[PDB]
């Protein structure tokens, strides 16, 4: 039973609200022509392989408006019948060639107000349903609305939802199915080959009338009561060429065409809440400066226990930490480091190049094309294009940009020419993904985020200059620089991640084998516990360049669980230390004061500062009303810290360069035995063409061997891999330094004598963990005065 | 001039003795069957593509028996048609199908004796020009043999030269015209298919009377004059399959059918000398037992100089000393670990495996089908034997065969079942070879030479129960474990290589930073050589890694140099300690006796035993007539001696997995625009189909998801490089165990106090030192002895 009555869940109360707003007995489409399909013979638009296909009798009749008379029950042209194209050229050339949408060739043009893009690889029919089940609710939620000067009454027609699937062979067969279910996709429409031309993508638009109404564990359920029209393009590529290539068909193609204004990021997973595309809407409504905003992006627990899944509640603690300290100060000071692919929107005008040719977009799209096997088929349509980029001189950085991705994006709209562009961040907007539950997908997931960072911030500090032409007010930009500082300081924190890692472990570790505190097995387990660090650290690497996650997830859940322990052992030692100063201040005597306990280095440093951190962090939940993450996913967070810092750091640098392309890329006869047992060849005969071979082959051998002098450009591949293993080099190198120096780990004990190190190196010591704790809490408070800024501006924006 | 009059060089006078022991005038060809062919249709043999074509009327002319008046000059029928077939089944099936060479064909049947089998990987023709007259020298020494009972006149009727060409469109072209020169190879005969069936092989066999009168540089001469005729078969491979299939085309397919004795293995560019093969011939046939032998290879030195090229000439000191010492230990024992591929020798009839089907050649040709993609073409004719050979259950050496390569043969044939074999070398067989003068292709040379030798090493030794049941006297089987015994020794100090080095270089380096003598750089200059060695080591292993040794050339180049350089401040700091420690000896006073000498740890470890060992070579090389190359060659090969432990040791093992294979390996339709407008399109029109796949889709997506439940076998590329991963860990585990007992260097520090850990470390690194010297020193006496009673066993076997 595919089709079932309409029920509401406990949380969708709200949706039967807007359902009564909805009248749902006006919704007749407007009338377009269609193009003549004879039987066949069919009439293609502009010369271009256009068929407008009847959909199934059956998804009609389930439609209100259908009589069982009429021959086609009388619904609309656009509810009557499916459209599809076939598009040859590509993403450079859509807008170029007579493509034209459905929604645009109405005889009176429709104006769009929000494209949803949504993208998709090879995922499940359910992740698909739950984000079209959001999409649909955000639309009717949309539609309902009343004393709206934009919405209301058909508003579904200034929405276009476009779903851009990657790889006509590699996407699921339930989905497929799915949005055959919806009506959008036909199996016998797609044609291969048009005019000799290869089909780049083919596009499937329908104005479907069909509602999920629930989405279970494994099945979906899809009715056709109380559902509000939709548009949907489908538009299935040919051949799988990443993400970057989805979004030029979403933007450089499809976007020209439409001219959409607030296009927003979806990915298949990602459930929206009822209302935040409004609220995303409306964030880029009230303020005319911003041209980018973000949402609140919140982790499932529905069938996950707190013990089970460690993993998936310290991903929880990362995420609400992020949305409640880092995302809020960044949109204060109007520059995010990041906006998420899962859930976002971008202002479409603000994305466009300049006249030069120069603008974030070209930036974006540069990526792709510099970082692939450099084989271009000269039969492609856009082999000018490409060559003609390849031809061009790249730097490391543009030749580098694959890793920021969308991140570049960001710095590019703020440190425009002459434009004043803003980025903001909106916590009414809400919206639901799953995290990865395996150890080996979290890794690979983990790698590109932390590449992407890097180089984002790398990138945007060193041309931080770029901002001084644009036209921001002067207090804007010097709050913009110290934003950019404060970057600068994370980043450097960030490099020195490993190091700083290990010199806190072994000072915490071998202060407890100091005779003066009464702990007999310190000094054996300090032992023991170097030397496993040791080997997990040169494990790591060694699996990094040589395995894949997948294959060897023993070893990195192996290594994480001793990380954990170390980390508990590490606190326990900390504690030990802690109360151990105490105890001798008070057995020193002659009273004690508040100045004492705040002149103590190890107290202070060990206590009051991770004790301000976790205070800092407390408030910090509690002001935004959301603090039970504080309690339910704070330790499996703490307890893996120390592995974001080493497993996924480790294999993101081993793994920069991403090779996805491999290596590289006339028969002389053919005998075939006739009836009799002879053999039908073609072999020379005449003396004189063996004599010419043979005097041929006397010249071919008898001549010098010129020098080769090839001097050929080389594959790309070995660029990148030399790049990523100076980038390791340069790590490691840093961080040896930095270790040496704090421990007097190197040759630098032999300039010092048997009894100097011990208090030189004591001394260093204190100095880097008094210097590391608290640069961790004085960024702490940084991010919390910025958050309560964003509450207080916020509300003042709100009684507004 | 491809042709020019017969010239005698300076050192070709012995050439000039055979010409006139030879008549030259009678070499008329035995008589044999044609195919006919008509014109076109060729009567195959056996229902096989066979063509009997006539050479180059000029070729012909060539030939002294070459008559104007004569349709074909006169010439028998082998001189006048070259024969071509094309092999279809492959080696397994070779001598199975009905498959016929010309030599066994002709009316009275030619029992080989001497297969002089040469392999080819496009290489230029000035290689196989060097290779192909130094085995015509042979022959013509063999030719003019009078008093022999095996050899003279018509001797080159029992010798057959077959070149295995892998991969057809990977032969150098300039080769392939110096065959066709020879009149073997014709152009328009091969055919890329026959009876729908792909020809695996194509064979070219002639009797040429072409002889190679002088190699230049550049050119390659060829003339007729005083030339003895040679039986030539050139097989070329369709695709290439590494040399392991060029072996089973020599061995399992071509052997079968010619059932030779004494197989001589040769390789491109090794020039054997005018004697050689007869030499080899007389050491198999003197003692029966004898199944295997090798010769000794030299490095050419032509036109390099002796600054200008410091690797050719570390080369040329390692060859040198290889033969003179190692080589005669092993045949003296009666077991060579490895006999060269370049240029060795087999009894055909000690490699047949038994009855049950288990021998030599069975496990080693095992390791290609084992290591290779498996992904099988159900097309193949040996698709039966390669599927049940991957349906066997492999343990870790049958899957990891590979790495031991011809190695593996040696330890076969002397512990075999029931027989009595022994491996035996020869110095008067002498065969000269270029050397790699490039970095980057002397450590892809050096990487499956290190590989193998390790492999097979530990095979043998794991294995060595396995000479109980060998037929030898009890006698043999001891001494052959005392042969084992010192293997293992060997193997042992091989594994710790890397590690002695490191504790060697920082004892050294450390020892003159005391301040008892007079040094002031010493500590700052062993501080910065610590922190340049610990760079370069990880480096190198990022490198062998990540990159190709082709491409980060001077990378290595630089380590190397640095190293030099280090090896050298070493053997200055030794000389210094050592002169410091003499000086205290006469400072100390009260005479001075042999006793204190011998007494005195640093002078008798340093000095002593160095010198033992220099002097051991020096009379080594000196007792064999070769002194040169202690001179010439010996400080090059000393100051690159640590390159070869820490650079070549670490790409080897980095590199254990040689995965040559990539990864893994319907058109909806077609529109064809008509002459008008309208596309010509083939989609559903009828309602019934229509409604009937709308439900399809609707039941497709209805269903619950099952379980995948794959548990498939997955590819091998992932356990090779698991094994390599595993192998490199425990590598580095146990070399810093090692180290860390014996500078202190990890947490054991902590179990000492301030004054203690001194003095404990300083002794433990003169233990450390004396041990390592003296082991050296006595593994060079063993070898010592070893090499001269090779030479007093070789004078009286030539007495008798
Ligand atoms: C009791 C609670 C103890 C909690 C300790 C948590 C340590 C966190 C360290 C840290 O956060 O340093 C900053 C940096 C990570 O930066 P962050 O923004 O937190 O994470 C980014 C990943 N998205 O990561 C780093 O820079 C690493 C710096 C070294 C961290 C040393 C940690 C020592 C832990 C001592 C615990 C003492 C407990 C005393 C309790 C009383
Ligand atoms: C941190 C220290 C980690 C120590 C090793 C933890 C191993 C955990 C484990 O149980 O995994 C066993 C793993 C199974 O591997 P397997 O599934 O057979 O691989 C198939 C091919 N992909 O692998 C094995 O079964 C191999 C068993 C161990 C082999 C020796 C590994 C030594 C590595 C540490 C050396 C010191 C550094
Ligand atoms: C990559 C991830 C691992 C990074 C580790 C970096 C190590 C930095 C070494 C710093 C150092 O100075 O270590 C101490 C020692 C030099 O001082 P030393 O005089 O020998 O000992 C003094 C004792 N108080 O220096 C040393 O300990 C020498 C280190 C060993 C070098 C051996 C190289 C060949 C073998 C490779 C082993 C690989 C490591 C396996 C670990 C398990
Ligand atoms: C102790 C805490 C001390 C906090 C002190 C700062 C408090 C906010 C002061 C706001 C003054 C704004 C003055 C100004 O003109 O700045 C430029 C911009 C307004 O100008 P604009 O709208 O861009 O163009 C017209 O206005 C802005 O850009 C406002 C940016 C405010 C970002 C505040 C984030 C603070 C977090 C770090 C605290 C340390
Ligand atoms: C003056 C002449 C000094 C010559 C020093 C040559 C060192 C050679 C060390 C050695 O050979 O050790 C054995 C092993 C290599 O074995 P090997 O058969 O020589 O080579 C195989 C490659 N085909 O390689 C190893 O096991 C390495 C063992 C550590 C080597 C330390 C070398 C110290 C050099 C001290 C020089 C002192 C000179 C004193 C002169 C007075
Ligand atoms: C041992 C220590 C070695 C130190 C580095 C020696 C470099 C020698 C050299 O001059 O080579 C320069 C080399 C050129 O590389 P390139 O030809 O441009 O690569 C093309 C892509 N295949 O590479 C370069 O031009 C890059 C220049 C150096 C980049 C920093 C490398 C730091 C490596 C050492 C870190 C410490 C460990
Ligand atoms: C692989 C090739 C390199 C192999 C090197 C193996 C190193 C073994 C280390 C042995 C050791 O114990 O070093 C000393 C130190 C522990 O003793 P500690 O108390 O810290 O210092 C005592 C000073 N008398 O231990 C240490 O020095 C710690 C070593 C650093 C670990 C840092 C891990 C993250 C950064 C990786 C840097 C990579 C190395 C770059 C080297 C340049
Ligand atoms: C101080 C130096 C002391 C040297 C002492 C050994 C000198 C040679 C003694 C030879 C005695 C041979 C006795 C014997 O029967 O051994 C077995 C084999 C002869 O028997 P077989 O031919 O195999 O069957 C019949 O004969 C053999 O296998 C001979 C094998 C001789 C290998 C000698 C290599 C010595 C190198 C290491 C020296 C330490």
């Not at 859509?94 to 060739?105: E, Q, S, T």
């Not at 000067?149 to 476009?162: L, P, R």
Request: hydrophobic share 40%.
């Amino acid at each position: 039973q595919a089709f079932i009555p309409h029920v509401y869940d406990e949380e969708d109360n709200d949706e039967q609200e807007y359902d009564q707003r909805i009248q749902y007995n006006q919704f007749q489409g407007d009338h377009f022509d269609l193009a003549a399909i004879s039987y066949t013979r069919a009439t293609g638009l502009n010369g271009h392989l256009v068929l407008d296909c009847p959909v199934a009798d059956e998804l009609l009749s389930k439609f209100p408006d259908y009589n069982p008379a009429e021959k086609s029950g009388g619904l609309s042209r656009e509810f009557a019948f499916m459209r599809y194209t076939a598009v040859t050229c590509g993403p450079s050339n859509f807008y170029r060639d007579a493509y034209i949408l459905r929604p645009v060739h109405y005889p009176i043009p429709r104006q769009t107000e929000l494209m949803i893009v949504i993208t998709m690889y090879n995922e499940d029919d359910i992740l698909l349903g739950r984000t079209l089940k959001g999409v649909f609710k955000n639309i009717k939620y949309l539609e309902s609305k009343a004393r709206s000067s934009t919405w209301g009454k058909d508003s579904w027609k200034k929405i276009v939802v476009c779903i851009v699937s990657d790889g006509r062979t590699k996407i699921n067969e339930r989905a497929q199915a799915l949005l055959a279910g919806l009506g959008v996709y036909q199996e016998g429409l797609a044609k291969s080959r048009v005019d000799d031309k290869k089909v780049q993508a083919h596009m499937f638009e329908y104005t479907t009338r069909v509602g999920i109404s629930k989405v279970t564990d494994d099945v979906v359920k899809l009715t056709t009561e109380k559902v509000v029209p939709v548009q949907m393009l489908f538009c299935l590529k040919e051949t799988n060429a990443k993400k970057i290539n989805s979004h030029r068909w979403c933007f450089q193609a499809i976007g020209q065409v439409l001219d959409p204004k607030i296009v927003v990021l979806l990915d298949c997973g990602t459930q929206p809440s009822g209302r935040s595309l409004y609220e995303l809407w409306k964030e880029f409504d009230r303020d005319h400066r911003v041209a980018g905003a973000c949402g609140e992006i919140t982790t499932s627990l529905k069938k996950r226990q707190m013990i089970t899944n460690p993993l998936v509640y310290g991903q929880n603690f990362e995420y609400k930490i992020s949305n409640i300290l880092d995302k809020p100060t960044e949109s204060s000071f109007g520059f995010i480091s990041v906006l998420p692919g899962a859930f976002s929107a971008y202002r479409f005008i603000a994305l466009q190049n300049d006249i030069n040719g120069v603008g974030p977009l070209e930036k974006y799209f540069k990526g792709e094309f510099l970082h692939s096997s450099g084989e271009l088929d000269p039969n492609d349509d856009e082999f000018q294009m490409k060559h003609l980029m390849l031809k061009e001189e790249a730097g490391i950085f543009t030749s580098n940009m694959y890793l920021a991705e969308d991140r570049i994006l960001c710095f590019e709209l703020v440190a425009k020419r002459g434009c004043n562009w803003l980025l903001r961040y909106c916590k009414s907007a809400r919206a639901e993904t799953d995290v990865p539950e395996g150890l080996a997908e979290f890794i690979l997931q983990r790698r590109r985020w932390l590449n992407g960072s890097f180089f984002a911030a790398i990138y945007s500090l060193v041309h931080f200059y770029k901002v001084w032409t644009s036209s921001h007010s002067f207090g804007r930009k010097i709050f913009l620089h110290i934003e950019f500082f404060y970057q600068l300081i994370n980043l450097i924190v960030s490099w020195f991640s490993i190091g700083s890692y290990f010199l806190v472990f072994r000072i915490l570790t071998t202060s407890l084998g100091d005779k003066a505190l009464g702990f007999a097995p310190g000094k054996i387990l300090s032992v023991i516990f170097l030397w496993l660090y040791l080997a997990s650290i040169v494990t790591t690497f060694v699996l990094s360049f040589g395995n894949k996650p997948k294959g060897t997830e023993k070893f990195y859940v192996t290594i994480v669980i001793f990380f954990a322990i170390l980390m508990a052992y590490m606190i326990f030692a900390a504690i030990f230390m802690a109360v151990h100063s105490i105890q001798d201040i008070y057995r020193s005597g002659t009273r004690i004061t508040v100045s004492l306990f705040f002149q103590n280095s190890e107290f202070r440093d060990l206590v009051v500062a991770t004790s301000s951190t976790y205070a800092l962090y407390f408030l910090a939940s509690f002001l935004y009303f959301e603090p039970w993450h504080m309690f339910t996913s704070f330790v499996q967070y703490i307890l893996l810290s120390p592995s974001y810092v080493n497993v996924l750091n480790i294999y993101a640098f081993c793994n920069i360069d991403d090779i996805s392309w491999g290596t590289k890329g006339k028969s002389l006869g053919e005998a075939k035995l006739r009836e009799d047992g002879t053999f039908d060849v073609s072999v020379p005969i005449s003396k004189e063409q063996i004599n010419q071979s043979y005097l041929d082959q006397l010249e071919k051998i008898r001549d010098p061997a010129p020098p080769e002098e090839k001097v050929l450009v080389t594959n790309t591949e070995d660029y990148y891999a030399f790049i990523r293993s100076m980038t390791v080099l340069v790590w490691m190198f840093t961080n040896f330094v930095v270790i040496a120096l704090v421990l007097e780990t190197g040759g630098f004990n032999q300039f010092v004598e048997a009894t100097d190190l011990a208090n030189l190196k004591s001394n260093r010591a204190a100095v880097f963990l008094t210097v590391i704790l608290w640069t961790v809490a004085f960024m702490a408070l940084f991010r919390f005065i910025g958050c309560i800024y964003y509450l207080i501006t916020r509300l003042g924006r709100e009684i507004k």
